[PDB]
Design a protein around this ligand. Structure first.
Ligand code: HEM
Length: 188
């Protein structure tokens, strides 16, 4: 996982559960508790997993629950940090651009198996978004959607259409319904 994002997760874990819980969890995997992670590092996914697992043990919170909340809160961090991804945009705009943004952000990562977040219109007031990846971070994904609705102050309805795994790839499809029309038919 790209360093920058892991950095944001750690800060969020601190916001959620406190510095001792997080400091201890980082040590248990051999990190300096105040380790400074850079945009160049590809942090080992297993070590992240063990960090979250340790936080789960210390807080008594379920790890899926933790990921959900980290997803929710992550959006506020992104909005204050990178205001450019949010500026002059509505929620639908923001969501439709995520796939492209993530391809840009992982272009340099050695081992090029980056998650896809392809969204497409399926009605005048609704899109389907499909998370496809090697990593199966379902709860994080859903939390991120909730965080986005929260930030843009646009109420949505989120229905999971299906989830599944095949050929090592996880897939989660959601239908997101907006309060009023955001699309119209157009000559193809
Ligand atoms: C400006 C806002 C955002 C930024 C800057 C951002 C950036 C990133 C970065 C750098 C990663 C690391 C991926 C890797 O290292 O392979 C990541 C992961 C991920 N992002 Fe975002 N993200 C944003 C918002 C969102 C939103 C709104 C969603 C969903 C609606 C989303 C879905 C995901 C998921 C599911 C992953 C896990 C990747 C995987 O499973 O391989 N992100 N994001």
């Amino acid at each position: 996982m790209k360093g920058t994002i892991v950095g944001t997760w750690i800060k969020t874990l601190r916001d959620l559960y406190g510095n001792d819980v997080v400091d201890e969890s980082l040590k248990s995997v051999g990190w300096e508790p105040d380790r400074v992670i850079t945009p160049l590092e590809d942090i080992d996914d297993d070590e992240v997993r063990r960090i979250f697992a340790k936080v789960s043990e210390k807080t008594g919170k379920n790890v899926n629950e933790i990921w959900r909340e980290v997803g929710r809160q992550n959006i506020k961090t992104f909005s204050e940090w990178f205001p450019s991804y949010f500026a002059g945009r509505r929620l639908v705009n923001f969501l439709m651009m995520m796939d492209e943004v993530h391809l840009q952000l992982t272009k340099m990562i050695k081992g090029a198996t980056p998650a896809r977040l392809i969204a497409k219109p399926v009605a005048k007031d609704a899109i389907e978004m499909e998370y496809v990846s090697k990593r199966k971070m379902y709860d994080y994904f859903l939390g991120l959607i909730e965080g986005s609705s929260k930030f843009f102050k646009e109420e949505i309805s989120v229905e999971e259409v299906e989830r599944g795994e095949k050929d090592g790839f996880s897939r989660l499809k959601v239908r997101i319904k907006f309060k009023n029309p955001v699309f119209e038919y157009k000559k193809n």
